[PDB]
Write an enzyme that holds these catalytic residues in place. Sequence first.
Site, PDB file in Angstrom:
ATOM      1  N   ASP A 126       0.840  -1.226   0.072  1.00 63.63           N
ATOM      2  CA  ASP A 126      -0.016  -0.011   0.252  1.00 63.63           C
ATOM      3  C   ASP A 126       0.784   1.427  -0.107  1.00 63.63           C
ATOM      4  OD1 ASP A 126      -2.183   1.751   0.055  1.00 63.63           O
ATOM      5  OD2 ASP A 126      -2.582   1.166   2.377  1.00 63.63           O
ATOM      6  N   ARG A 130       0.381   9.589   0.808  1.00 66.33           N
ATOM      7  CA  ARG A 130      -0.545   9.452   1.950  1.00 66.33           C
ATOM      8  C   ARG A 130      -0.069   8.584   3.041  1.00 66.33           C
ATOM      9  NH1 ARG A 130      -4.054   6.545  -1.281  1.00 66.33           N
ATOM     10  NH2 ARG A 130      -3.938   4.054  -0.880  1.00 66.33           N
ATOM     11  N   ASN A 131       0.887   7.437   2.856  1.00 61.28           N
ATOM     12  CA  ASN A 131       1.476   6.406   3.449  1.00 61.28           C
ATOM     13  C   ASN A 131       2.921   6.677   3.856  1.00 61.28           C
ATOM     14  OD1 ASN A 131      -0.950   5.187   4.136  1.00 61.28           O
ATOM     15  ND2 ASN A 131      -0.970   3.934   2.222  1.00 61.28           N
ATOM     16  N   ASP A 144       3.143   3.385   7.478  1.00 64.19           N
ATOM     17  CA  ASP A 144       1.858   2.671   7.240  1.00 64.19           C
ATOM     18  C   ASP A 144       2.155   1.114   7.142  1.00 64.19           C
ATOM     19  OD1 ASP A 144      -0.963   2.170   7.013  1.00 64.19           O
ATOM     20  OD2 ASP A 144      -0.593   2.136   4.721  1.00 64.19           O
TER      21      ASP A 144
HETATM   22  C1  V0L Z   1       0.694   5.712  13.142  1.00 63.42           C
HETATM   23  C2  V0L Z   1       0.652   6.736  12.292  1.00 63.42           C
HETATM   24  C3  V0L Z   1       1.807   8.064  12.806  1.00 63.42           C
HETATM   25  C4  V0L Z   1       3.006   7.740  12.990  1.00 63.42           C
HETATM   26  C5  V0L Z   1       3.838   9.060  13.422  1.00 63.42           C
HETATM   27  C6  V0L Z   1       3.189  10.164  13.683  1.00 63.42           C
HETATM   28  N1  V0L Z   1       3.600  11.230  14.063  1.00 63.42           N
HETATM   29  C7  V0L Z   1       2.737  12.159  14.018  1.00 63.42           C
HETATM   30  C8  V0L Z   1       1.732  11.713  13.629  1.00 63.42           C
HETATM   31  N2  V0L Z   1       1.818  10.354  13.374  1.00 63.42           N
HETATM   32  C9  V0L Z   1       0.968   9.290  12.911  1.00 63.42           C
HETATM   33  N3  V0L Z   1       0.846   6.436  11.100  1.00 63.42           N
HETATM   34  N4  V0L Z   1       1.979   5.509  10.792  1.00 63.42           N
HETATM   35  N5  V0L Z   1       2.176   5.334   9.495  1.00 63.42           N
HETATM   36  C10 V0L Z   1       1.238   6.185   8.911  1.00 63.42           C
HETATM   37  N6  V0L Z   1       1.008   6.620   7.516  1.00 63.42           N
HETATM   38  C11 V0L Z   1      -0.008   7.354   7.023  1.00 63.42           C
HETATM   39  C12 V0L Z   1      -0.576   8.153   8.300  1.00 63.42           C
HETATM   40  C13 V0L Z   1      -1.893   9.008   7.960  1.00 63.42           C
HETATM   41  C14 V0L Z   1      -2.297   9.843   8.734  1.00 63.42           C
HETATM   42  N7  V0L Z   1      -3.401  10.666   8.538  1.00 63.42           N
HETATM   43  N8  V0L Z   1      -2.885  10.558   6.998  1.00 63.42           N
HETATM   44  C15 V0L Z   1      -4.133  11.249   6.051  1.00 63.42           C
HETATM   45  C16 V0L Z   1      -2.076   9.579   6.751  1.00 63.42           C
HETATM   46  N9  V0L Z   1      -0.323   7.866   9.373  1.00 63.42           N
HETATM   47  C17 V0L Z   1       0.665   7.061   9.774  1.00 63.42           C
END
Ligand code: V0L
Length: 268
Positions: A126, A130-131, A144
């Site tokens: 994936d 966005r990831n 992600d």
């Molecule tokens: C667990 C989450 C994550 C990891 C670190 C972090 N620091 C501040 C906010 N955070 C959020 N995370 N881990 N991998 C990710 N990939 C994407 C996203 C995400 C969140 N919102 N969107 C739009 C994408 N969040 C993710």
Amino acid sequence: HVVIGPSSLIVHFNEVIGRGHFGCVYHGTLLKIHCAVKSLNRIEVSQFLTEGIIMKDFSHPNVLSLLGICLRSSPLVVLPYMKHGDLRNFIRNETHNPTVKDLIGFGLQVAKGMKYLASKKFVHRDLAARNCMLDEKFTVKVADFGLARDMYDKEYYSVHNKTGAKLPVKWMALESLQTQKFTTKSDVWSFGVLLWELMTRGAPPYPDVNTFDITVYLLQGRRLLQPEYCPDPLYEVMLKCWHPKAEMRPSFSELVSRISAIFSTFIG
Ligand SMILES: C[C@@H](c1ccc2nccn2c1)n1nnc2ncc(-c3cnn(C)c3)nc21
């Protein structure tokens, strides 16, 4: 080395910093380091810790690391704090103004992260802007995955009727759309879409298409267009990523080489 004592972690449950289908992300303090804490209450234990151990063994500057797991009488995933959030929202933000060199650099960082993961024989499944995330130093981290894996923007996932699975169809390789088989070579396809996403500053791919309509679309001889300020050899790189034959697509090793060559041609 993965388990964190409850005494060591403070979770700021009052202020939510992310929303996923499996659970929310909160601001956190790990003893005095700042972190992100993902909950799973919105949904095997043996495979859970196994996933944690694997994620901890991953050490690369462009891969989101695992700080650890906290056990509370759902478990909490402790991840490093990412100041600038996800890559897609960052490049979409009007207050920031990255140059074309900057955007290519963000793509080169993802390729470096993916070259590392592919060498460990880890298939993402994936990959999309966005990831990926950005920390204070503007370091892109392929995120992600493992215990951080979720559906963070539900808009770009279509439900298969005969399977019931949430699939990121606009990022999926042709063979993944037909057979649901994911490999490193299909992650390479998704990397081409990430390249397109960066060069358009987070525009949604194939706006004119509706879900699984995408398979016939690509089979009609169609590919995403070259964005306005995307260099010709960068668009050449994307076209190689979307080759119908997976084995004909470049490796992330080749991608690091070709993109760093394109990147070195820019002044700033
Ligand atoms: C667990 C989450 C994550 C990891 C670190 C972090 N620091 C501040 C906010 N955070 C959020 N995370 N881990 N991998 C990710 N990939 C994407 C996203 C995400 C969140 N919102 N969107 C739009 C994408 N969040 C993710």
